[PDB]
Design a protein around this ligand. Sequence first.
Ligand code: HEC
Ligand code: HEM
Ligand code: HEM
Ligand code: HEM
Ligand code: HEM
Ligand SMILES: CCCCCCO[C@@H]1O[C@H](CO)[C@@H](O)[C@H](O)[C@H]1O
Lengths: 49, 89, 370, 365, 241, 96, 74, 73, 49
Amino acid sequence: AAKNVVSQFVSSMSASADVLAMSKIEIKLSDIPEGKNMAFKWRGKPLFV
Amino acid sequence: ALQVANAIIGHYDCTYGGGAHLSSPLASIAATNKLCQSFQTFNICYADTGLLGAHFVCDHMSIDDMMFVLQGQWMRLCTSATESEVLRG
Amino acid sequence: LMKIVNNAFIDLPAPSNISSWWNFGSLLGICLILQILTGLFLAMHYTSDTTTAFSSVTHICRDVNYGWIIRYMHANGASMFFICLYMHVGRGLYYGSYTFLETWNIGVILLLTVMATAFMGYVLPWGQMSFWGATVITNLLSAIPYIGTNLVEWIWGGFSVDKATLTRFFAFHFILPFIIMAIAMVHLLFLHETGSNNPTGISSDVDKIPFHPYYTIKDILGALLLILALMLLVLFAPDLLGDPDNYTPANPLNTPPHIKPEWYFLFAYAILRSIPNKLGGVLALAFSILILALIPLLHTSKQRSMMFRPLSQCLFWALVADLLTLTWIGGQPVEHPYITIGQLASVLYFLLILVLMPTAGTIENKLLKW
Amino acid sequence: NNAFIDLPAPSNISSWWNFGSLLGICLILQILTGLFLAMHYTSDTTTAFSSVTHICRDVNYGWIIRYMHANGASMFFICLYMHVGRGLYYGSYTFLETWNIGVILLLTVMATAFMGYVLPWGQMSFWGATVITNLLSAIPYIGTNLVEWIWGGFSVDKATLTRFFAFHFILPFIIMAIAMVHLLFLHETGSNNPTGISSDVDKIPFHPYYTIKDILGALLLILALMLLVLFAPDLLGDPDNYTPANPLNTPPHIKPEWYFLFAYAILRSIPNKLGGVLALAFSILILALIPLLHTSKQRSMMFRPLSQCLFWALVADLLTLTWIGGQPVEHPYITIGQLASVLYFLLILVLMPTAGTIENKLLKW
Amino acid sequence: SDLELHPPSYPWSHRGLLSSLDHTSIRRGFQVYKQVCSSCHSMDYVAYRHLVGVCYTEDEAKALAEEVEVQDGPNEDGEMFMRPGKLSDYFPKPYPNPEAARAANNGALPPDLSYIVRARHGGEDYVFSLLTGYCEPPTGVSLREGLYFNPYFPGQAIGMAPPIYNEVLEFDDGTPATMSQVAKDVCTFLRWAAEPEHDHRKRMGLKMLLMMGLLLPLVYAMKRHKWSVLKSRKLAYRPPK
Amino acid sequence: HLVGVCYTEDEAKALAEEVEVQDGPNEDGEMFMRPGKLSDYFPKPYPNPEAARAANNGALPPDLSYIVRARHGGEDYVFSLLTGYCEPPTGVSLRE
Amino acid sequence: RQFGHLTRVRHVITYSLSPFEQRAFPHYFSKGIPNVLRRTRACILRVAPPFVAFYLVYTWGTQEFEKSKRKNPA
Amino acid sequence: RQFGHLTRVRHVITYSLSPFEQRAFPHYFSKGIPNVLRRTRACILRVAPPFVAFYLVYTWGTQEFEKSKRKNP
Amino acid sequence: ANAGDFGGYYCPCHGSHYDASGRIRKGPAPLNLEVPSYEFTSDDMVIVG
Ligand code: HEC
Ligand code: HEM
Ligand code: HEM
Ligand code: HEM
Ligand code: HEM
Ligand SMILES: CCCCCCO[C@@H]1O[C@H](CO)[C@@H](O)[C@H](O)[C@H]1O
């Protein structure tokens, strides 16, 4: 009983279901001039192209 | 072996010259902390049974401490008797 | 580290005969810890802005892992808290435990603080009951002459219940339980000066047993039964003791036609509703709780407990039946014949405590020739 | 009473002994201003920063309560560092229980202030939450899991801000309970004094002597706090936190709150992840080792010249590390910081214990 | 009028204490919400991803989400745009705000349905009765245009026209779409919408009952063991005399 | 906020009315424009930063409510920046 | 309050058995039921009446309420 | 720890005056300054050097830093 | 981007220098910046994830 209870509480702190709903991102390359580092917000973090 | 064990814990009374320095932890604690007037271990034998234990005399406020230390000593002998205290016994 | 954990628990002397009615003190301690634990975890996902409060609660119940069980455990735990509180107070009245004046009066403060705490928590999800409960209860203060209205607006942070209200209520609801915990520790310290009373009302100094292992195991058994009752509610009927109207977001333009208080406030609401006067109802409400502080001064019997007092027992159960009547009436519309039944029940409540019981006490004394 | 009024106290404790009560006052001040700010603060990332500006612009006197809370946190650390310094210098650490609880208190206050700084969700709030929680990622095998669990996701976000408000809200009350335990252990022995010699032959009652002296100290604390709040509320703060959090960009001259600069300098001096984290942890936890490193036959440093010189070298070194923490990771700061970091541990682990032994020799015992 | 007609108790297959929801029925119920109710009622707290592993596979749910266009943006030009829906999107709202909804419904407001079953006394018994209970006004009752007589609605005058009837939609599994069948399935779906934790709490409840059936008598045995020392103790009074 | 600081209540009222702000929904569920009033915040020049960057060759004009507290040097910095534009030194060539 | 300082007791002997030497449920049903029945009987006349009264007031009031909500031919 | 049970003291006499019979600032400046000067001098050699070192390291490092950022250091 | 001693990237938090490949070259970082899964599609587009 303690194991189940404790793990359910601990689990409530892990990423909630909405946070896990991830997908892919499409990026238009013709907008990134040569020499440029473009930053996008993706899956929570910065994505450099 | 029970007699040896009982000799390790021993006996004691307020007139013993030993005091704090007595070898038996029970006698030593009892003397320094004034836990009892006296105590004695015993091994009363009968044909196929007997009474192995101790008797003590103390102030009304020292019974619990006496019992605590006495039982702690039996327990220590069960799990941790040392060669040197056993040779002494 | 040892002592005061111990001589304050392990070798604590306790009566050999306290019954199950003495289990509610530890059950209240457990309800408090439960509320605090589930409360903190809910607070890790709850947001107090009116635009997002209701939403954050549905997010807890729908998307946070096990968020639903923590939420319904908190909601139903508040109900268990009151069931235990009322059993605890009843035990005290029946057995004359109130003669421990300090312990008793601190207890009265504890009851009031838990009521205020539960009130504020109910406001947090910002559903319809949340909003109108915040409106009505804070307005009780408007009965205070000269400054009443000013006090209300100050509490609200404006001219009506709004964002400022919800945000401060989250803060008040957050800290109050910890204050309750400190008050309860004082509750216990005063009790330890005397030790517990027992079913007979007779000193038990000639027959004490150590709290451990006798009451430690008995309290654990009680704790298991409390958890069973709680989980029967959480897992099989989580909304049974709740109100459907709070599943509707707050609407400041419309008060639901059959609005009614949380079940544990129904008896007091019935009493207030029975008096067709603003100040009069507020005073009757306040007095319905504060009268508990008067019980000790109303004790007339030569005996502490009601165990050996037949007449007092009959009146005691009439009081309980009466509170049950007021609870039922509080759930009914303000129509005939409920308006009259409630007024009689309200009058009967104060009559039993202020007049009938003290009188039964004296009569019993006479019958025993002292 | 007897926990205050007739509490026996040394007749000679100095102003260095005023910081304990001042810490109590800093704690009460933070709790009072904190609760009032919590009455108007909202923890959703969409509205946190906004609610703080709302407090400062529209809540009656919201600005003074806010800046008193921000600057109060700085006063808290000034007092904490003075309090610890007094303890090291006078050998107060020999009161082991009191001292170790004190170490727990320091760590809890640090953790508490860290989380509060995240609440306004400005740039420093966001990157501080990122960096500090990531310290846990140095833990082998499960480190990364612990971080995501703390964050409630794969990066600092809403879930993080909301739980941090809750943690920051309750921790100070826990600190208060721990501080009461701190005092209870102290009361078993009573206070140490500048001489390090038992003062049982000359005790005076806490009231009225130290009650009035503590009040005078409290007045000076309030003056320092209000000089900051009314004349320079941003002096000890960072301009970058007036910029809302931007997860796509870490400010180029990002630096920690001033009271964390020395530790940050130490971590930055080691070009290894686990090594830097271990040095950081150790720079604080080493306080727990001080008692075991005491070699002197005397408790206080009052009568120990060599020990005093090394003590001030340690303070000057922490001042050096504080300065370095505020400078870019460039030459010659990289090397000065490495030397200062090494000197810190060397003074505590080797030079001071050695000075203690030499002094004993010179006194012939 | 102020007279009230309370709903009877239908024997829902999820009514029992250990009875789970019928997931095929949840699935058909979603088709009803989608095909019929969604044009006027929002369901703001349910997303396509919530359907996965409940009544649709991940791919089916994705396909369902892509059947709609949702607003997103800003793009790099600072403008909003439309895109096919995805699992993380919440069910599309039929109106931008309550004012618009009222405008589109003769002034009445179709409430959000995410919690309708928990937000109404009688729950699905009430909703099923309302949907299948429209009838002619009794003699002497005349409703303003825009209102329909429904004995189960408070006051009996509702702003919603009968929304379902035989063949109002076709089910993916060929189930005959009679009005009562459609009502029964949408209600089952609405129960799940209001209480997605429904099946899990009951499974847990079963485990809780079994564990208590074990722990309660065992702890009780432990209680009696310890207490036996006292329960069988014997006293004797031997005063000097 | 300008009232009693640098403008009277009526002057500020007139200032607010010089602009149109969005409000709504009305009873038809639609948004509409109206003259500004004292409770309105200063109008934003762009609906979002993307539109701002787009309108400014990719650079983002920061919000100015806290710019002085958000920059080392405060107004000394801002004054120096505004009055300090000059030709690039020899050897420096900036992108358009 | 501590054992050793509660009160004065003289001439009382107490005999007890180790829990390992005895049954935890001696005559549980054979003697427990009779005792439950006895306890129940001893209190019923003090506990039940008020609740019966409640039941009567409850049923009477509820019925009177429904009756008042109908068929009033005028 | 309570007065009455702290420690053993014999043959010590203590004479005191009521605060109402005496000055609160006797020779405040006339004797206070000399004492401050004495205390300041007695510690300076132990306190100041490390801070002087800090100052030197501080000025040296800062200058070295600037010099390194230009064409001709 | 474009800072540090390798014309790659410079992390201002504790001085980690990366090259234009995202590889860690100097400082306390233990690993090269993560390379996510991606595929170059039609047009001049890249889908990451
Ligand atoms: C628009 C053309 C509608 C369709 C299609 C359906 N509903 Fe509806 N419903 C509509 C309105 C405007 C209202 C408001 C009625 C009022 O007078 O307030 C409603 C209301 C409901 C309710 C709430 C009833 C209550 O007790 O308040 C329910 C339970 C309801 N509607 C359910 C529902 C379902 C499940 C539908 C698809 C089968 C459905 N409605 C269609 C407008 C419209
Ligand atoms: C948060 C609320 C409360 C907690 C946590 C609490 C806890 C306790 C505990 C642990 C005990 C000892 C065990 C027991 O006898 O039950 C006790 C005893 C007692 N409590 Fe409370 N209590 C609470 C509320 C109250 C209230 C509301 C009252 C009465 C107005 C009250 C009155 C008493 C009294 C008089 C006793 C003595 C009981 C006796 O020995 O007969 N308590 N309580
Ligand atoms: C005496 C203890 C407590 C009581 C009686 C209590 C009571 C309540 C009640 C009745 C509600 C409304 C439940 C509902 O949604 O229907 C509530 C909500 C809430 N409580 Fe508590 N509470 C207690 C302690 C705490 C503590 C200590 C915290 C947080 C540190 C807390 C946090 C919350 C939160 C976040 C909510 C909103 C979410 C929700 O509605 O479930 N509570 N509380
Ligand atoms: C929330 C933080 C803290 C509070 C409220 C606090 C409070 C106190 C108080 C009230 C005193 C007595 C007055 C004094 O001598 O200063 C004291 C003494 C002391 N504290 Fe703390 N403390 C805190 C943190 C710490 C820390 C971080 C340390 C050291 C790591 C510590 C170590 C000690 C020691 C050793 C003493 C005995 C001092 C002596 O008698 O010389 N304290 N503390
Ligand atoms: C050990 C005591 C405490 C410390 C050291 C502390 C420290 C801090 C720090 C450093 C900040 C950042 C301030 C800023 O720059 O804006 C903060 C923010 C805040 N603190 Fe605390 N705090 C303490 C206690 C509390 C308590 C008890 C509460 C509330 C119950 C609280 C409520 C807040 C709130 C709501 C904010 C956000 C608004 C703001 O940034 O001013 N704090 N705290
Ligand atoms: C333990 C069983 C107590 C009786 C449960 C009834 O509970 C009541 O149900 C009503 C709906 O019928 C709710 O509106 C009300 O708030 C609730 O307290």
